[PDB]
Amino acid sequence: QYYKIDTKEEILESARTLAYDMMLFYKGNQSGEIPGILPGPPTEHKGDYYWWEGGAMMGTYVDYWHLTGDPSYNHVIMEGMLHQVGPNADYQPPNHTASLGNDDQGFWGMSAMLAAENKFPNPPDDKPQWLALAQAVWTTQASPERHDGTCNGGLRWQIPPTNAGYNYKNTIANACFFDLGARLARYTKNNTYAEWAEKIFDWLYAVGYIDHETWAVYDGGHVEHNCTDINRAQFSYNAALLLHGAAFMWNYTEDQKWKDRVDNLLTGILRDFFKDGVVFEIPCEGRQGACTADMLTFKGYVHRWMAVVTQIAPHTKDRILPVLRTSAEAAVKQCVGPPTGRRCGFYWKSGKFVDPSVDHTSGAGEAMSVLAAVSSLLIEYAEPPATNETGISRGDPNAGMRSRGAAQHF
Ligand SMILES: [Ca+2]
């Protein structure tokens, strides 16, 4: 094995090197390139990765600095986050219309929310602020045209009615909106965020995307079938994002129902996604050559989000931290690939390095996931997410409400 993770110092060093190797994939800070995205999209033969994965990368680095204290990449990350906000400061840049799912937009909003929670340095005074960006995403997602009567509610996957997939009401779109609402409630102490989060969670439960018996979290269903044709694929990030938002709701409300939901979701995750102590992407990881670029990133989110759950729902700590530790041990055990002797693959449970070329990418998602897992080993030393009591960001009461906003010409 290359990386050592048996002391705080060793973890910091490993995380710093993993942060370097992940940054090698990113060209957006170089002259002539576009800040905030990884190479791509593959539809243009520019690289393997879609726009939202750039947003995921940004958030990974906001967490990296929070967890390690290393500010080396902060300027690059601020530039990338600010470049992608769109003319209306809502993470709906129209050049990216084909990538404007509610989940895609949501992941950028979540990275802005994380920047506010982590006290990431503020953008310049004339630029959109982190809390305001999260509020804009949430507000656009709360807009009435995104909540119709099909399936008795829920967000559709896609924002544009003409985008393929507009007929699919899926967990991840709704989970992003839920998580943002829960987090905005905690940060701002505004209950309207929480009431929306409650409503969307209750919808996810009612429609049966959350299994009422097992608390498995399925993928979605289509409006033409009243959402009854449930795609029962269980992607790790869906259950983990609901756990994350439920933990924020528990912390904010202190309502036992939210504690119960945290505990049930957590039981399900530990049962379904951890195999001998290692996170495992059940719909695709069982053989090589099945996971898509997007799927290679999920286990990193699982680690980072579950780590935060231990801070804001502390009763979960002893259920979560030991399992994240064994999972991160497996992650680093297989970061031994050529040509560097430390290249990271995806198949952590297997115990062996597998070249990312088997899954048809350069390996940025695998690198991001190991960076996330190793950095999050430092959660015991980190501050919990800030609220407006100690945060330094600023909001906007009209976030998402501009007259040129896309909702005005829907
Ligand atoms: Ca490719």
What string of H, E and C letters represents the secondary structure of 128-160? CCHHHHHHHHHHHHHCHHHCCCHHHCCCCCECC
Write the single-letter amino acid at 97: T
Annotated binding site: 48, 104, 360
Phi and psi, residue 176, nearest 5°: -65, -45
CA dist 359 and 135 (Å) reads 36
What is the distance in A from the centroid of ligand 1 to the CA of 76? Answer: 25
CB burial of residue 9 (10 Å; 0-12, 13-18, 19+) = exposed
The technique is X-ray
Closest CA to 3 of 12, 357, 355: 12
Closest CA to 316 of 307, 326, 303, 327: 307
| Domain boundaries 8-408, corresponding CATH code | 1.50.10.20
Handedness of CA 92, 93, 98, 99 (dihedral sign): negative
Q: Do 312 and 248 meet the contact criterion of CB atoms below 8 Å apart?
A: yes
CA dist 179 and 134 (Å) reads 11
What is the distance in A from the centroid of ligand 1 to the CA of 125? Answer: 39
Ion ligand 1, residues whose Cβ is below 5 A away: 48, 360
Write the single-letter amino acid at 221: G
Annotated binding site for Ca(2+): 48, 104, 360
Query: Tokens for 408?
Result: 């005005």
Whose tokens are 């062996």? That residue is: 352
Phi and psi, residue 235, nearest 5°: -90, 135
What is the distance in A from the centroid of ligand 1 to the CA of 88? Answer: 32
What is the distance in A from the centroid of ligand 1 to the CA of 361? Answer: 4
Phi and psi, residue 260, nearest 5°: -60, -40
Query: Mapped to the 3 state alphabet, what secondary structure does the chain carry?
Result: CCCCCCCHHHHHHHHHHHHHHHHCCCCCCCCCCCCCCCCCCHHHCCCCCCHHHHHHHHHHHHHHHHHHCCCCCHHHHHHHHHHCCCCCCCCCCHHHHHHCEHHHHHHHHHHHHHHHHCCCCCCCCCCCCHHHHHHHHHHHHHCHHHCCCHHHCCCCCECCCCCCCCCEEEHHHHHHHHHHHHHHHHHHCCHHHHHHHHHHHHHHHHHCCECCCCCCECCEEEHHHCCCCCECCCCHHHHHHHHHHHHHHHHHHCCHHHHHHHHHHHHHHHHHHEECCEECCCCCCCCCCCCCCCHHHHHHHHHHHHHHHHHHCHHHHHHHHHHHHHHHHHHHHCCCECCCCCECCCCCCCCCCCCHHHHCCCCHHHHHHHHHHHHHHHHHHCCCCCCCCCCCCCCCCCCCCCCCCHHHHC
CA dist 276 and 307 (Å) reads 19
Taking residue 211's Cβ as centre, other Cβ atoms within 10 Å add up to 16
Which residues, listed in sequence order, are joined to residue 278 by a DSSP beta bridge? 275
CA dist 266 and 389 (Å) reads 29
Q: Do 300 and 347 meet the contact criterion of CB atoms below 8 Å apart?
A: no
Which residues, listed in sequence order, are joined to residue 210 by a DSSP beta bridge? 217
What is the distance in A from the centroid of ligand 1 to the CA of 338? Answer: 19
CA dist 258 and 245 (Å) reads 10
CB within 8 Å of 95: residues ≥ 6 apart: none
Q: In units of Å, what resolution does this entry have?
A: 1.0
Closest CA to 186 of 128, 237, 244, 146: 244
Query: Tokens for 206?
Result: 């009612």
Handedness of CA 154, 156, 157, 160 (dihedral sign): negative
Q: Do 370 and 344 meet the contact criterion of CB atoms below 8 Å apart?
A: yes
**Breakpoints of the chain, after residues (C–N > 2.5 Å):** none
Write the single-letter amino acid at 1: Q
What is the distance in A from the centroid of ligand 1 to the CA of 238? Answer: 24
CA dist 60 and 70 (Å) reads 13
Whose tokens are 């939202």? That residue is: 52
CA dist 356 and 335 (Å) reads 11
What is the distance in A from the centroid of ligand 1 to the CA of 366? Answer: 14
CA dist 367 and 356 (Å) reads 10
What is the distance in A from the centroid of ligand 1 to the CA of 342? Answer: 21
CA dist 23 and 105 (Å) reads 22
Does residue 35 have a cis peptide bond before it, meaning omega lies within 30 degrees of 0? no
What is the distance in A from the centroid of ligand 1 to the CA of 11? Answer: 31
What is the distance in A from the centroid of ligand 1 to the CA of 357? Answer: 8
CB burial of residue 294 (10 Å; 0-12, 13-18, 19+) = middle
CA dist 157 and 153 (Å) reads 13
What ranges do the domains of the chain cover?
A: 8-408
Whose tokens are 């965020």? That residue is: 193
CB burial of residue 271 (10 Å; 0-12, 13-18, 19+) = exposed
